[model samples]
Target: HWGYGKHNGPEHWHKDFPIAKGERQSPVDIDTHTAKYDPSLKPLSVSYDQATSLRILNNGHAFNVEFDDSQDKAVLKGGPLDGTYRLIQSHLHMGSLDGQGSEHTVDKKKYAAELHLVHWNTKYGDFGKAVQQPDGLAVLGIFLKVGSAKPGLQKVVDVLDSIKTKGKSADFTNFDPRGLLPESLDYWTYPGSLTTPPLLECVTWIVLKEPISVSSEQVLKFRKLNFNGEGEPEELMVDNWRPAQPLKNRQIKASFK
Candidate 1:
């Protein structure tokens, strides 16, 4: 798989994949006030089930979770969404330091980290077909801050010791991702694109305002996940976050009273 080096960071990524230049990027700064945000604009509910099939993938750049479509569902507008969108994959983008792990900052406050819960609309049959449509995908964004230690994240972190080398993943068991979400389900909704390459401009982004807290040590361990392939000598893979982009004219509607 591909690996990251001094010459292969985000700055030089456009060279390998020219389409990145025109992609609608993420990690952008959000300055608007959610107080004025209308609650009616948000989805009705986002439920999680224990049977949600989970798989850990070492997709060259980072480790992510892939959810099995056969077991999950997303309800919107008082009905099962127009299409059956399954939680396909989820990952994070963070900085090297504990003070600035998130890619996007609201009013200049940086959090400890950001979690991306990705889902695909199965209306078109599969991810490939759904991703091609404007409303094909939905992603849940959760922020993390450094605070008293929490065991919710350890489900994924404990296995890091074995996959710490790089580009390596093990069958992480007994992990419940629902435990990682914040107490409040309130979120900011908007139409946007993926943060990564291909940068498809069809994702419905739902960013949670309330951030969950994790310990300082857990943040350090996450930074150990390397971009280089496994067995390639332990190298620091911290600071994989992308800088926030301009909001342009996009209206970021919120789900709060």
Candidate 2:
């Protein structure tokens, strides 16, 4: 299985999923000095219906809180996107310690953790078909730094105890993901691929410039969720983040000056 372990880590992913080495691969270092300010880019808009949240599960890789994206109840629009994109799921990536874990870095500085709110362009009908189109997905990346506990994230942290092992899930509802966002919507936009395997190059990444806060103690809760199944030998889930990829010929645009 492809995991963050020695033999099956991100470095070895390209062997099975050739697209992992593709040109538009994700989680690139955001060199703010090189990012161009674009006056044309509009502010991002996200509306998530609290009732759309269904369940929270540890999918072996990360704990994901899925949403009922059937009727575009939770939608993301504007900012580098052409049409509406429905929310699919939200997941996290973190390290064993506080200084690392975020997939995308700002000026090479890593955050303690990161949250990805995955959405599929409604124009493509659904996620399966959207993943095949270039402008099919818009992923919102929010960096989570260590600080005082955030009320919005506390709810998620409290639920981690129920899903301590891979494949474990519990009913997680009435959660509005918009509560997880920072006050400012300033971001850096780029064309990139999924940070994980299959590494599909069909994402318009909108990574927020400002980050939200989570307590160091709360971060420890994520580590308790094992990568292995309930009956298997325990493998703590940490450093489940991909390192920065080469920017190639891509240009990153910033929504803020």
Candidate 3:
């Protein structure tokens, strides 16, 4: 498998996964000045129930907070989507204390971290089938900056200790992802693919304008996490970010003028 290491990382992913060099690859530079004001773009409709939050798993790539999406307990609609996109999982990407680690950069400025909430279009039978189509997925991206500590985030961070090792997982419940979002619903929309390998070109990206806050102490925890599981060898999981890709011809749209 391709892990984000100095030698065999994103640069080498294309060797194994040829689609890594696809035209619609994600984490592109959002040039606001060039973004078109889309009067037709609607406000993001996110309906997520706290009870739907199931368990948290550390899949070695990132700690994913899974939601019970068998039903419409949570759904993402509007914001360039044709229909309902069911919420499935949410995760994050970050870097070491000294550097920024966001996947998406705006105006060439990178943030400390980025949060991704993944949803699949309900038109498809399941996420597995949807992930292969262009309009199959929608992912909401929220930037994380170093500021005052976030109270809502404490619940998520508190569990990091239990899932320090790769492949570790623990019970997580009653968490509302809505509380993690920024105040403004304004966003930049685009057509892009999953940032990780087997980089599927099925995502409709909605990147928020406002950023949420995390503390300096919390940032340290991201670095302490290991890429390898306990006993084999210790590998720091920091700097797990894909650099911005070149925007070929996709139009990046703004919800607000």
C-alpha lDDT of candidate 3 relative to the true structure = 0.87
lDDT of 1 by residue, 123-185 (tens): 767778877888888777889998977687777777776666545666754455677788887
Task: Please state the error at residue 241 of candidate 2 in Å.
Answer: 0.2
lDDT of each: 0.68, 0.90, 0.87
> Model 3 over residues 135-237: C-alpha lDDT tens digits?
9999999999998888778887777878888889888886689888888989999999999988999999999999999888777776677788888688888
Tell me each candidate's TM-score: 0.86, 0.97, 0.97
Candidate order by TM-score, highest to lowest? 2, 3, 1
lDDT of 2 at 7: 96
Write the candidate numbers in order of decreasing lDDT: 2, 3, 1
Q: Give the TM-score of candidate 3.
A: 0.97
- Best-fitting candidate, measured by lDDT? 2
